[PDB]
Design an enzyme around this catalytic site. Sequence first.
Site, PDB file in Angstrom:
ATOM      1  N   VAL A  39       0.809  -1.213   0.000  1.00 37.59           N
ATOM      2  CA  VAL A  39       0.000   0.000   0.000  1.00 37.59           C
ATOM      3  C   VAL A  39       0.846   1.268   0.000  1.00 37.59           C
ATOM      4  O   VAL A  39       0.332   2.356  -0.240  1.00 37.59           O
ATOM      5  CB  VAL A  39      -0.942   0.044   1.223  1.00 37.59           C
ATOM      6  CG1 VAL A  39      -1.966  -1.073   1.125  1.00 37.59           C
ATOM      7  CG2 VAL A  39      -0.135  -0.081   2.510  1.00 37.59           C
ATOM      8  N   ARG A  41       5.206   2.854  -0.556  1.00 39.14           N
ATOM      9  CA  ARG A  41       6.632   2.683  -0.829  1.00 39.14           C
ATOM     10  C   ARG A  41       7.405   3.758  -0.068  1.00 39.14           C
ATOM     11  O   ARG A  41       6.805   4.608   0.585  1.00 39.14           O
ATOM     12  CB  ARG A  41       6.912   2.822  -2.333  1.00 39.14           C
ATOM     13  CG  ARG A  41       7.072   4.266  -2.825  1.00 39.14           C
ATOM     14  CD  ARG A  41       5.842   5.121  -2.533  1.00 39.14           C
ATOM     15  NE  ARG A  41       6.097   6.549  -2.724  1.00 39.14           N
ATOM     16  CZ  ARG A  41       6.970   7.258  -2.011  1.00 39.14           C
ATOM     17  NH1 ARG A  41       7.681   6.679  -1.053  1.00 39.14           N
ATOM     18  NH2 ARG A  41       7.133   8.552  -2.254  1.00 39.14           N
ATOM     19  N   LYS A  43      11.815   5.506   0.640  1.00 44.92           N
ATOM     20  CA  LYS A  43      13.266   5.394   0.577  1.00 44.92           C
ATOM     21  C   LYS A  43      13.830   4.575   1.740  1.00 44.92           C
ATOM     22  O   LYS A  43      14.936   4.035   1.652  1.00 44.92           O
ATOM     23  CB  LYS A  43      13.894   6.791   0.567  1.00 44.92           C
ATOM     24  CG  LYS A  43      15.414   6.795   0.523  1.00 44.92           C
ATOM     25  CD  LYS A  43      15.986   8.190   0.246  1.00 44.92           C
ATOM     26  CE  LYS A  43      15.680   9.191   1.358  1.00 44.92           C
ATOM     27  NZ  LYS A  43      14.239   9.566   1.439  1.00 44.92           N
ATOM     28  N   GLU A  46       8.922  -0.186   3.015  1.00 49.51           N
ATOM     29  CA  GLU A  46       7.797  -0.594   2.177  1.00 49.51           C
ATOM     30  C   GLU A  46       6.658  -0.888   3.141  1.00 49.51           C
ATOM     31  O   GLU A  46       6.865  -1.522   4.177  1.00 49.51           O
ATOM     32  CB  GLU A  46       8.118  -1.864   1.385  1.00 49.51           C
ATOM     33  CG  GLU A  46       9.051  -1.670   0.206  1.00 49.51           C
ATOM     34  CD  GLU A  46       9.221  -2.949  -0.597  1.00 49.51           C
ATOM     35  OE1 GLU A  46       9.594  -3.978   0.008  1.00 49.51           O
ATOM     36  OE2 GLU A  46       8.982  -2.926  -1.824  1.00 49.51           O
ATOM     37  N   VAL A  47       5.461  -0.424   2.810  1.00 54.34           N
ATOM     38  CA  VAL A  47       4.314  -0.639   3.677  1.00 54.34           C
ATOM     39  C   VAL A  47       3.367  -1.641   3.038  1.00 54.34           C
ATOM     40  O   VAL A  47       3.141  -1.614   1.833  1.00 54.34           O
ATOM     41  CB  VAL A  47       3.566   0.687   3.949  1.00 54.34           C
ATOM     42  CG1 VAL A  47       2.468   0.470   4.986  1.00 54.34           C
ATOM     43  CG2 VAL A  47       4.551   1.741   4.434  1.00 54.34           C
ATOM     44  N   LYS A  62       5.270  -2.851   8.098  1.00 59.03           N
ATOM     45  CA  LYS A  62       6.307  -1.974   7.589  1.00 59.03           C
ATOM     46  C   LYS A  62       7.633  -2.722   7.566  1.00 59.03           C
ATOM     47  O   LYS A  62       8.143  -3.121   8.610  1.00 59.03           O
ATOM     48  CB  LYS A  62       6.425  -0.724   8.474  1.00 59.03           C
ATOM     49  CG  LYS A  62       7.433   0.302   7.971  1.00 59.03           C
ATOM     50  CD  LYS A  62       7.525   1.519   8.890  1.00 59.03           C
ATOM     51  CE  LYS A  62       8.433   2.585   8.281  1.00 59.03           C
ATOM     52  NZ  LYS A  62       8.451   3.863   9.043  1.00 59.03           N
ATOM     53  N   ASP A 150       8.952  15.215   9.879  1.00 56.55           N
ATOM     54  CA  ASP A 150       8.610  14.755   8.537  1.00 56.55           C
ATOM     55  C   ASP A 150       7.110  14.871   8.292  1.00 56.55           C
ATOM     56  O   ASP A 150       6.484  13.972   7.732  1.00 56.55           O
ATOM     57  CB  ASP A 150       9.090  13.309   8.304  1.00 56.55           C
ATOM     58  CG  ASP A 150       9.170  12.948   6.812  1.00 56.55           C
ATOM     59  OD1 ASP A 150       9.290  13.868   5.973  1.00 56.55           O
ATOM     60  OD2 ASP A 150       9.124  11.744   6.475  1.00 56.55           O
TER      61      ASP A 150
END
Length: 327
Positions: A39, A41, A43, A46-47, A62, A150
């Site tokens: 679901v 992406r 750096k 990946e989720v 994750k 972030d």
Amino acid sequence: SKARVYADVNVLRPKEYWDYEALTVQWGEQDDYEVVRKVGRGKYSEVFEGINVNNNEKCIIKILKPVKKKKIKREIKILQNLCGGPNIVKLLDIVRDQHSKTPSLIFEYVNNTDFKVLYPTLTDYDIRYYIYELLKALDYCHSQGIMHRDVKPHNVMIDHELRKLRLIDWGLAEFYHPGKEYNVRVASRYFKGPELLVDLQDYDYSLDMWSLGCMFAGMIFRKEPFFYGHDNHDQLVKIAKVLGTDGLNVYLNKYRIELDPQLEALVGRHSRKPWLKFMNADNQHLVSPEAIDFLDKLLRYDHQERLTALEAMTHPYFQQVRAAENS
């Protein structure tokens, strides 16, 4: 420079609370969570929308890319410290692969509706509501001595049908210590505050309020990257073309900031553009005087002038969201 609030949180607290490099991870079983479909992406990861083989309950998996174990322990401790707070993603488990040794964090499940398709349908009230909800999240982590660093649309999952919200991805978050000099390479370019762009290293929680301000501007004006710069030097030029260059000089002079010759020339001199000149038929249904007053108090060059997450929640703009919440 020092935060104007929550400055002593980690000073009064035991080193156990903020000393993350001494964290000893108690891994679980990767042999307990199954991947269903990617679901998201990134750096650094990946989720995946996953399932909990046990409870049968859905979850978010994750999978972290390869990085120094320092950054992995940091994200873990912070998530443990923040578990429970309002609108903060909840960490449920931590697992790893035996051969590859790839770490994985297990989170509560949230549908999550892609912001590039959601935001356009948000109504004037929806916007007031969701921002108010994100502010509860920020006031909470700041009160716990943590900066997210972030904040952006991608890190705010929204289940628009249930009107639920969660601030996610604490992979760049850090503990705030008065006077400490942090790394300015945090956040995504479009949401980086002036301090990170002019290299002011002893920044604080107010960094998140600038990022939020950029998010807000993007939504009321219906122009996602509100400040759309191709690189860091270009990012500051874009900011200076809206807020004016006089305010930047005051900021630079106040904190005795250098500002290298290239970026300075690159920036030049610009007068301030009043917020109303950004109004158009496509966004006039969302631009009210109260929205403008609020945004104005968020996007200030000087990090110490910006509204705190707590002051923001009480602004008249959220007047109805508060009354509806009260009763």
